[PDB]
Amino acid sequence: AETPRTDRGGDSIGETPTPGASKRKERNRPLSDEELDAMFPEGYKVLPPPAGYVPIRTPARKLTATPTPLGGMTGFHMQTEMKSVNDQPSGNLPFLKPDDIQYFDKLLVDVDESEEQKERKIMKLLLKIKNGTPPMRKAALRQITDK
Amino acid sequence: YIADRKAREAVEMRAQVERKMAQKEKEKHEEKLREMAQKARERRAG
Amino acid sequence: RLPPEVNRILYIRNLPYKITAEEMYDIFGKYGPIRQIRVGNTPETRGTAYVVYEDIFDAKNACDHLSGFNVCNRYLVVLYYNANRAFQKMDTKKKEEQLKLLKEKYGI
Amino acid sequence: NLQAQEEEREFYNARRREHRQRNDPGGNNKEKEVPAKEKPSFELSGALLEDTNTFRGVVIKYSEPKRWRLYPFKNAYLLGRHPIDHPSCSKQHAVFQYRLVEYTRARVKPYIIDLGSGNGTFLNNKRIEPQRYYELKEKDVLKEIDDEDEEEEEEVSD
Amino acid sequence: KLINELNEREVQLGVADKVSWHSEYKDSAWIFLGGLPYELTEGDIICVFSQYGEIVNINLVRDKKTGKSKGFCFLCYEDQRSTILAVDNFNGIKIKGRTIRVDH
Amino acid sequence: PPPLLVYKWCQGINNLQDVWETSEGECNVMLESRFEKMYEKIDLTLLNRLLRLIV
Numbered sequence: 245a246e247t248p249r250t251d252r253g254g255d256s257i258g259e260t261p262t263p264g265a266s267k268r269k270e271r272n273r274p275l276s277d278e279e280l281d282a283m284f285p286e287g288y289k290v291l292p293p294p295a296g297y298v299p300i301r302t303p304a305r306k307l308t309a310t311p312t313p314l315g316g317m318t319g320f321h322m323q324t325e326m327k328s329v330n331d332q333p334s335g336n337l338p339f340l341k342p343d344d345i346q347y348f349d350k351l352l353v354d355v356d357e358s359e360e361q362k363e364r365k366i367m368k369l370l371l372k373i374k375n376g377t378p379p380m381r382k383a384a385l386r387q388i389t390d391k
Numbered sequence: 392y393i394a395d396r397k398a399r400e401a402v403e404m405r406a407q408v409e410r411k412m413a414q415k416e417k418e419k420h421e422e423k424l425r426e427m428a429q430k431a432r433e434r435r436a437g
Numbered sequence: 438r439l440p441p442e443v444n445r446i447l448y449i450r451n452l453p454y455k456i457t458a459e460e461m462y463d464i465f466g467k468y469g470p471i472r473q474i475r476v477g478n479t480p481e482t483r484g485t486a487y488v489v490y491e492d493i494f495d496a497k498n499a500c501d502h503l504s505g506f507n508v509c510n511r512y513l514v515v516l517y518y519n520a521n522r523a524f525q526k527m528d529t530k531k532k533e534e535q536l537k538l539l540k541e542k543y544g545i
Numbered sequence: 546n547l548q549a550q551e552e553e554r555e556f557y558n559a560r561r562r563e564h565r566q567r568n569d570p571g572g573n574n575k576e577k578e579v580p581a582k583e584k585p586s587f588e589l590s591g592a593l594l595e596d597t598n599t600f601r602g603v604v605i606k607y608s609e610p611k612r613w614r615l616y617p618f619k620n621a622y623l624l625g626r627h628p629i630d631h632p633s634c635s636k637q638h639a640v641f642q643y644r645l646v647e648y649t650r651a652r653v654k655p656y657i658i659d660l661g662s663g664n665g666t667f668l669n670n671k672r673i674e675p676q677r678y679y680e681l682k683e684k685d686v687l688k689e690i691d692d693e694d695e696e697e698e699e700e701v702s703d
Numbered sequence: 704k705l706i707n708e709l710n711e712r713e714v715q716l717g718v719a720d721k722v723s724w725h726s727e728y729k730d731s732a733w734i735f736l737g738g739l740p741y742e743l744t745e746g747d748i749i750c751v752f753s754q755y756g757e758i759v760n761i762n763l764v765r766d767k768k769t770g771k772s773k774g775f776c777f778l779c780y781e782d783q784r785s786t787i788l789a790v791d792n793f794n795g796i797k798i799k800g801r802t803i804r805v806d807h
Numbered sequence: 808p809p810p811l812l813v814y815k816w817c818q819g820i821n822n823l824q825d826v827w828e829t830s831e832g833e834c835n836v837m838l839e840s841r842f843e844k845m846y847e848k849i850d851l852t853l854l855n856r857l858l859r860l861i862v
Contacts, residue, residue, distance in 0.1 A: 254532040261536060264545050272445070272493065280473065282527035283446070283520075284487060287479035293458030301462060304470040305491060309631050313602065313616035317594050321406055324399045324860065326510050329451075346448055346519060353481055395856060423703050425611075428603045431684050431697055432610045435669075552770030556746030561799035 338376035439497065445472065446518035447488045447496050451511045452476075454483055460508070461486070467502075469495030487518060569629045573642055573660055576621050579650040583619045586653035600655055603697040607688060610695070618655065618698075621647035636693050638664050647678070655681045655698070665689025706794050706806065725787040728807050732759075734786055735806050737775040739763075740799040748776055755792060756785025 280290075292298050300307075330352045332340050340348055351368045372384040461474060465488050472489035490496050496517070505512045539545070564571045587597040602616030624644045627633035634643065643662040648655050659666050661675040672689040673679050687696040713723065736748065749758055763776035780786055786807065794805045820826060826835065 251529040254529065254536070257536055258532065261539055261545070265539075265543075268543065268545050274491075275472065278527065278531065280489075282524055284475055285523040286526065287477060287482050288475040288487065289478045290473055290475055291458045291461075293462050297459060297462040297466070301466055301471040304466050306633070308469050308495075309633060310614050310616070312620050313618065313622070313632070314614060315601070315617065321410075323403060323406060324395075328511065343516065345450075345514065346516060349450070349485070350481055355480065395859070420703055424601075424699060424701075427703075428697055428699060429611070431686075432603075432605050432695070435686055435695070435697075436610060552765070555744040556749070557744060558750075559740075559742050559744060559747040559799075561740060561742055562747055562751075565799065 332371075338372065338380060340371070341375070344371075344374075439493070443493065443497060443500075443517040444520060445490055445493045445496055447500065448514075448516045448518040449486045449488055450484065450514035450516075452484045452486060452513065453509055453511065456508070464506075464508070465499065465503075468499040570641075572623070572629065574623070574645045574647075574658065576647060577649060580621050580647050581650060581653065583648050583653050586650075587619075597701070598653070599701040601699045601701060603699060605695040605697070607692045607695050618646065618648065621645060634694075638693070640664075646681075649678065651680075657681050657687065667692065704795070704804075706790070706804075710791060723787075725791065725807075728786075729783070731807055732781075732783055732786055733777050733779045733807075734789055735775065735777055735804075737804045738801060739772065739774050739776060739803055740801055741772050741774060742799065743772065748778070751798075752778060752789060752793065755788045756780040756782045 303310075331337075332348065332352055333354070337351070345352070348368060348371050350365065351371065369384050369388055372380045373388070376384075458474070458476070461476075462471065465471065465474070468490065470491045472491050474486060474488050476486045477483050488496075488499075490499075500515050500517065503513070503515050506515070507513075567573070567575055583598065583600065587599075590598070592598065600618035602618065603611070604613045604615070605611060606613075622632045622645070623630045623642075624632045624634065624639075624646060626636070626639040626641050626643060630642070632646075636643075640660075640662045642660045644657065644659045644666055646655065646657050656678045657668070657673075658678050659673060659675045665672050667688050667690065668679070669686050670688070670691075681698060683698055683700050685698055688694060709724070736752075739748070745761065745763060748763070749761065752758055758778055758780050761776055761778035763772060764774075765772045780789070790805050790807060794803075796803050825833075
């Protein structure tokens with residue numbers, strides 16, 4: 245709790261810093277690697293591929309103006325011709341809207357049967373509550389009540 | 392099935408041919424244009 | 438002239454397990470400078486990645502042209518990544534030093 | 546009987562009007578009604594990239610006559626000092642707004658317009674006066690007096 | 704803010720013209736623009752609201768001593784249908800970050 | 808629409824180069840026909856390879 249309130253004080257103070265600066269002079273404000281580690285969930289890695297491709301990313305700003313003013317185009321050739329994809333299969337798994345994938349992606353992968361990760365994995369019964377037939381919603385609802 | 396395999400192969404070969412004949416042309420065009428530009432700058436100097 | 442829900446972060450999927458960050462930086466590097474990019478190295482998250490740009494409109498042109506764009510045999514899933522959700526793994530702190538700095542240097 | 550009332554009135558523009566209506570700062574030189582990109586005007590010409598009309602830029606550093614890059618005009622463009630201006634220029638003499646290059650319709654034609662940069666700008670080493678669109682023809686040169694750089698224009702052919 | 708929801712109950716129910724509540728007046732040009740930004744001035748608001756008509760004369764209330772706007776203006780057009788158009792149209796508008804209000 | 812096609816067809820004929828000139832013994836031939844059984848004689852196996860060239 246003292247930490248909770250400590251956060252609001254810092255929040256208002258940064259508001260006074262930014263607001264003040266304009267007088268002295270949004271969501272697009274540049275970010276820090278701890279702030280970067282703050283957003284994304286567990287289990288991901290940061291990559292450099294090169295130092296050189298990274299220098300391309302740094303020149304990219306300057307080259308977003310520069311290389312957009314330069315030669316470029318795309319074309320296709322006529323030639324004869326694998327196609328993987330995932331819905332939510334198991335037995336049934338009522339359908340996923342194209343956005344909801346972000347939430348339910350963990351259910352899509354078929355890796356199965358090896359603790360908590362299996363409780364989150366089995367907790368996708370939510371999906372059965374959200375979308376599905378009314379009976380699936382009923383039975384799912386009870387099953388999650390008793391659990 | 393044989394006709395399809397050999398046919399696809401042949402058309403592929405013809406494709407790398409057309410591409411190979413294309414790139415030389417592109418570079419010839421860029422060199423030509425660069426020559427025109429250098430001549431233009433020289434005419435700008437004098 | 439933009440929908441509010443889109444954000445500088447894009448969730449990208451339908452990736453191979455062999456895929457190289459060279460192709461990543463090259464391809465995605467069209468629209469703008471990369472803030473950075475993460476890739477799942479973990480058993481479930483392998484095949485997924487997150488891209489973050491210095492500007493949103495970068496990402497907007499990205500999902501515009503990169504929509505269902507192809508790599509290898511695959512058509513990548515390109516979505517605007519959500520916010521909040523799982524955050525509090527990290528904390529709010531370390532504001533004191535930087536704020537003391539801006540209060541020191543410029544004196545404001 | 547010096548100043549009857551101390552306030553009176555204005556009847557004048559407001560900073561938030563012109564501000565909000567043009568922002569990258571606020572900018573000048575809002576595009577005229579005609580402006581249209583050159584590629585789509587090559588589409589109404591029925592021209593694939595082979596026979597299409599694309600204006601490429603050519604650089605020569607004014608002291609030494611080539612390419613630091615080469616620039617397409619096809620993708621108007623704001624020529625300025627560097628962030629606001631799209632066509633950033635390292636030249637220290639360029640005002641924060643130096644000039645602009647707008648393709649207009651009279652046909653799809655290139656145009657250069659000075660923003661009234663303090664120094665000016667030289668065209669073929671011959672300056673133009675501010676505040677009018679001046680058509681450019683191929684091989685023309687841009688840098689008002691001797692200018693760290695030079696520029697040339699080329700249509701794509703041969 | 705309440706206006707726009709009255710125009711929605713007027714359009715949704717099929718009010719059909721002359722029973723419109725702009726017929727409440729018929730006698731009045733002068734319009735009320737409140738919630739205006741303080742940087743604004745005569746020539747400005749004239750330039751924005753001459754869109755829907757020709758404004759004859761506007762008195763914007765500006766505090767007598769300090770000589771700055773109190774934040775609102777009473778305006779007068781040459782045409783009433785310009786007033787009907789302006790109240791029914793120009794309302795709920797953003798100016799300099801703040802949404803102005805208009806009414807007869 | 809089909810009748811407009813008929814019109815495009817007639818004026819298409821009449822706009823041909825020297826179409827009606829019989830001076831040197833030129834001869835015009837109109838030919839109309841059907842493919843008789845066409846649907847019924849399509850071969851599925853072949854049709855598969857033919858579609859593989861398209862989609």
